[PDB]
């Protein structure tokens, strides 16, 4: 139990870098985050149609758990506000599921070990292994073809801005000219607090995107470093923490979106 943590086989170092631009032989260049985003979209649609092609009473199997999750989401969003518990449900549900599966993708082996490339070898008396990679030739970096979609600041910014636009539009859907009444109404000190309110409303999507991107990228980096330190039997609790926090942050994003919607409409 306490003698099988050999460091003889492992990565040579720790690789940290934002998603690497893909080869993009044809026009409209893509990234390694875009392809995993599309494949996870495909997986989400496949599970949705699997739960959809067989829709009936007393669900069992995949459909039963899917309906459990969906009704739990209804219960959670209903506790905030039932006025828009269904109108805004598809957006937050889709973003939730996609972020969930993106965070799940980071645990899959080959993320960072597969390189698209556009014991004895390990150093003795050292805590980290020094085995040269497959792509170590040509002075390459072994570009990770597989990566977490939320570990890129393009998707996170995109969902943040679309969520902000959705919230602002649905607040503007039925509020009249009450926005200007909440922002610098020139009524004593109420004008001052509206300015900070306006700035906070502006920075909410940026905060969400940066938070999610940082969470996922930090999880990936810490898992890579824990693998580099000791190969086996060490990073189990941290892998468990990652698989927990991925789902946790996934539900948090949707919950925060609904909460911002409610605080804007009310």
């Amino acid at each position: 139990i306490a003698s099988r943590f050999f460091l003889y086989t492992g990565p040579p170092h720790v690789e940290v870098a934002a998603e690497v631009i893909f080869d993009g032989i044809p026009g409209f260049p893509i990234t390694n985050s875009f392809v995993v985003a599309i494949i996870i979209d495909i997986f989400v649609i496949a599970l949705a149609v699997a739960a959809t092609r067989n829709l009936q009473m007393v669900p069992r199997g995949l459909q039963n758990v899917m309906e459990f999750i969906l009704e739990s989401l209804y219960n959670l969003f209903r506790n905030i506000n039932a006025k828009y518990v269904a109108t805004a449900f598809p957006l937050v549900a889709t973003i939730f599921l996609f972020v969930l599966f993106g965070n799940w993708f980071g645990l899959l082996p080959g993320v960072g070990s597969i390189g698209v490339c556009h014991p004895l070898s390990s150093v003795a008396a050292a805590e980290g292994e020094e085995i040269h990679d497959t792509c170590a030739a040509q002075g390459k970096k072994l570009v990770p073809l597989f990566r977490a979609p939320a570990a890129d600041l393009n998707f996170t910014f995109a969902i943040a801005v679309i969520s902000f636009v959705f919230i602002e539009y649905w607040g503007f859907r039925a509020l009249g000219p009450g926005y200007l009444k909440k922002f610098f109404n020139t009524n004593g000190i109420m004008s001052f607090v509206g300015i900070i309110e306006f700035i906070s409303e502006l920075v909410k999507p940026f905060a969400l995107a940066f938070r999610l991107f940082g969470n996922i990228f930090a999880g990936e980096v810490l898992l890579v470093v824990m693998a580099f330190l000791v190969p086996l039997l060490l990073p189990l609790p941290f892998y468990g923490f990652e698989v927990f926090v991925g789902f946790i942050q996934a539900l948090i994003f949707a919950l925060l979106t609904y909460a911002f919607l409610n605080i804007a409409v009310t």
Partner: protein
């Protein structure tokens, strides 16, 4: 990665994914909602039907007593009226027989009265013979009773 072309493409992809959500999400939402609505409607139906059935069997058993009530009421009326007429007829028959029996008895008495006219002279002869021993010496004619006895018979 800070470029306008990538950000616009990501925004367009997000908009397409959000637009695609409208058709798909309506499926499971309807699947959960339609079931609940049908259940509630069927539940109202059950309440109503069960109440109706329960409140009607009790009334049928009440009509069972009511049917028996008419059965008992007819029984007394049929029994009493028939008995009263039968008793009245029997008493009238008794009354008619009372007139008949008494009348026949009176007729027989009247007949016997005249018929016994053979007994006035009979008792005359009885005094002539049986009273003879009651008088002096059982001499039927005594010493003049003979002719006198004839006068007694004539009387």
């Amino acid at each position: 990665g800070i470029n306008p072309t990538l950000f616009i493409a990501q925004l367009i992809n997000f908009l397409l994914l959000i637009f695609i959500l409208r058709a798909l999400l309506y499926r499971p939402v309807m699947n959960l909602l339609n079931e609940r609505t049908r259940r509630i409607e069927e539940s109202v139906r059950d309440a109503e039907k069960v109440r109706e059935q329960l409140a009607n069997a009790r009334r049928d058993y009440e009509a069972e007593i009511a049917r028996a009530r008419q059965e008992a009421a007819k029984i007394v009326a049929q029994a009493q009226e028939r008995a009263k007429q039968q008793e009245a007829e029997i008493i009238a028959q008794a009354r008619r027989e009372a007139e008949r029996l008494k009348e026949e008895a009176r007729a027989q008495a009247e007949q016997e009265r005249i018929r016994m006219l053979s007994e006035a002279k009979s008792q005359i002869a009885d005094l002539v013979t049986l009273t003879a021993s009651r008088v002096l010496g059982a001499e039927l004619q005594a010493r003049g009773h003979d002719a006198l006895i004839a006068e007694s018979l004539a009387a």
